[PDB]
Design a protein around this ligand. Structure first.
Ligand SMILES: CC(C)(O)C(=O)N1CCC(c2ccc(NC(=O)n3cc4ccc(F)cc4c3)cc2)CC1
Ligand SMILES: CC(C)(O)C(=O)N1CCC(c2ccc(NC(=O)n3cc4ccc(F)cc4c3)cc2)CC1
Lengths: 464, 464
């Protein structure tokens, strides 16, 4: 990795664009005014990309050669990068202050600030905008996952009277559906801030290396079938595939995809009749989890439950909701996003089915179908010092008041009613509010404050 | 990187689910049912993740320890992975056949096939599905970028009579807007299959390392301002910022964001009057490129062009379209996706503005706002050998005929009219459609066939 090659091209040319005699460039990140966001992921970026000796003679030469060809001009700040190498042994003279990871903050608040600690590196602040703005992705996955947990918690509490097993109700199926191996790890780790069920193995090693848990692992899974393990038996031997699979995993929960040919037939005739004796004998700790994987997600879930309800002993829980026997559950793992998740749990409640009956698997909806636009994650310069005088800077486009940025030195505070407020123009310097909630997390090439994944999960807890 | 930890969790348990005495598992990839797709990105995955010694005793032990905790049980195939290490020195006994990279193929055709070369490794074929299915991402970026080039080519031809500078008309602004550094490189490289303009520097090194070009670089950029380089001068010194920037880059094209406070005022009064003398003196090789960055993308482009048309000398080209002087252009770099790109060029044509006047910058729309669902990229088992007998395997869900998969051994052929056809059930073995278009690209840990980035670009060319 070469940080000199880890920026938008045009940032290579910005050192010649700032006002002459500029000694400080101070910038901030916010999720411009999903009412609240989970701050997560910056510690990964600080450690993997920004800390320690990030500048070498070889990296400067490599960047110089690439940019000469890329621009067809010599515009690269070789002097500026050589200065950091000589004066700081390649360590970045930047100070980053951030809200603690896992913190749940309303939209339009300062989440982190960045500034150069040496007047000579005024240009460095926004050089690293590209890399830091990528924190939008773990913030957005964590936020969107937590919003799904709110929906699940609400319906599980209403239909059962408690939240038991809530952290296993939304499983990450997104490994194949993301854009890269790196994204897989980051995205899966952000989902694990709220849940404990994952198939995206990449997430485990990222948490282990960059965050850490008291438990050996932050996420868990169970044995499960795929179409290849069912269909490999041949179209006429679907029952043989099912029988073999539930017998191989007779003492642990087992998920079995049942829609290869006819989901409704598999539920009613194969599970419901032919193999019913292998299901009703299963432990409460080892249910069969039937998995539909096609059709309208709500219509399929309801029809599967109505079929199962007629083949298996259903009880009525203390809330008046229908409950399958404990050796039998359903996981809907196709077409799940925050919208369909809501439609399904509402549909189940209307048909008097407890949410204890179901779990959800989500791939693209959980880890890929997200953009920087969802939370309006934005990094902007708010303060500069030029000729020894600090000036409060901002943008305010005539056609879009929503794109107006904050002015001056910023600080995040608790209000008297316990809410949040971002103080602009250095007004945090007046001791009118409590202590600033932003802490120095990075300074002059060193990570100065870190959080465990356990601390992050506690911070991200729901009120319920 | 550890390939034993680079799969969906449930795939760890599949070796115990296939029929006993299974010696071959053969699977394929297609973009089920954007009528044609650019095949790109597999060579990156083959080299970075699949080739050479990918299994070590340490990797087996690391996977065993992780899975024991992740499943709360011993389900990991230690014996199977140790076999590959001992017999093949950790080289994968897999054979992958693929259509050449850059090839433009209609939907619903076999793009690549995977199968084990050792009967003992029947479980390996689908172990690597997760890693290979991630090729959906470079395929989708390349396809979506090429569809935008079709729109640009059509309107540029119609309004100017030629395609000059077409490959610089859609610039990649997506570095900050993607989910990771790895995704940035992959996505930027896929855009460069069709265009030559990029700010996502990560793309350059990926192409250099995995594909290669005759030219020193596959992509190019020009100096450009950002809001921080304008706003740092203070709200009352926007003219001073603009003057400094165009003077610093007086001999190369320069892009200048002009919407910090009032885009229309900046065009009419600042560029159009106060600084007009610094613009009209510019070389044809060094235009000022005015950049709006907010408001309705079409309304803003049209209004900016009407303002500029009244302040600067406009000509009528040979097609009857309005053309700004050669030292002045516009780039729309906000809210650009395939839909808005179409709306803008159509809007310009209706108001008699040549597409030579404009270029587009696209970030999230080009590299992030995409999913595996857009082209229905899918990997499925189509053929297995059990007890020495080959059987044609497929799925066919009752509620979704679109999810029906292909049967048996597959082959890709040219039809008599020069179109494409995927032959199923080993029917390619009959010499009726001639030679199979898929080539062995990977075999037993080695890449057996590769393409340069130059070969890929030629293959991906538009007919026009
Ligand atoms: C249902 C209840 C009571 O909430 C519960 O007991 N649990 C515990 C068991 C839990 C679980 C965990 C993993 C799986 N996995 C699968 O179905 N697969 C993994 C996949 C990965 C990728 C993919 F494309 C498809 C997949 C199918 C099922 C269920 C749900 C909650
Ligand atoms: C206009 C015409 C004739 O098609 C032409 O001459 N060319 C040549 C010059 C070309 C070009 C190349 C790069 C840039 N860059 C920028 O504006 N920035 C790069 C950014 C990256 C990220 C971001 F958030 C904002 C950005 C602003 C402008 C223009 C357009 C086609």
């Amino acid at each position: 990795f070469n940080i000199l090659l880890a920026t938008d091209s045009y940032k290579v040319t910005h050192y010649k664009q700032y006002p002459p005699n500029t000694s400080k460039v101070y910038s901030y990140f916010e999720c411009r005014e999903y009412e609240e966001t989970v701050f997560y992921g910056l510690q990964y970026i600080l450690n993997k990309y920004l800390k320690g000796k990030v500048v070498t003679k070889e990296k400067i030469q490599e960047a110089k050669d690439v940019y000469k060809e890329h621009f067809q001009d010599d515009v690269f700040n070789e002097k500026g990068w050589n200065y950091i190498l000589e004066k700081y042994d390649g360590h970045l003279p930047i100070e980053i202050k951030a809200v603690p990871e896992g913190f749940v903050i309303p939209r339009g608040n300062v989440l982190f600030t960045v500034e150069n600690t040496d007047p000579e590196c005024y240009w460095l602040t926004n050089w690293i905008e590209t890399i830091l703005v990528q924190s939008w992705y773990p913030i957005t996955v964590a936020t969107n996952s937590r919003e799904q947990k709110k929906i699940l918690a609400k319906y599980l509490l209403e239909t059962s009277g408690n939240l038991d097993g809530l952290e296993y109700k939304l499983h990450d199926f997104g490994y194949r559906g993301v854009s890269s191996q790196e994204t897989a790890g980051i995205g899966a780790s952000a989902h694990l801030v709220n849940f404990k069920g994952t198939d995206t193995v990449a997430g485990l090693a990222l948490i282990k290396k960059y965050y850490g848990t008291k438990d050996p692992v932050p996420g868990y899974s169970v044995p499960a079938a795929e179409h290849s393990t069912i269909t490999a038996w041949g179209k006429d031997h679907e029952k043989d595939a099912f029988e073999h699979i539930v017998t191989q995993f007779s003492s642990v929960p087992v998920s079995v995809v049942s829609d290869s040919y006819d989901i409704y037939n598999a539920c009613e005739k194969i599970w419901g009749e032919d193999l019913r004796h292998l299901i009703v004998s299963r432990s409460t700790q080892a249910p069969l989890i039937i998995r539909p994987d096609s059709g309208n997600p709500l219509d399929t879930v309801l029809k599967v439950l109505e079929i199962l309800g007629k083949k298996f002993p259903v009880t009525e829980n203390s809330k008046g909701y229908k409950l399958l026997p404990p050796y039998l559950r359903v996981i809907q793992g196709d077409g799940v996003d925050i919208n369909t998740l809501q439609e399904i749990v509402e549909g189940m409640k209307q048909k008097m089915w407890s949410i204890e009956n179901i779990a959800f698997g989500s791939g693209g909806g959980l880890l890929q179908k997200l953009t920087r636009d969802l939370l309006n994650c934005s990094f902007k310069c708010s303060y500069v010092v030029t000729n020894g005088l600090g000036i409060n800077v901002f943008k305010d486009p005539v056609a879009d008041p929503n794109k107006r940025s904050k002015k001056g030195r910023l600080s995040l505070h608790r209000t008297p009613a316990g809410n949040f407020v971002t103080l602009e123009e250095g007004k945090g310097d007046l001791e009118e509010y409590g202590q600033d909630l932003l802490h120095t997390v990075f300074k002059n090439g060193k990570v100065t404050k870190s959080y465990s994944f356990d601390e992050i999960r506690k911070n991200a807890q729901l009120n319920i």
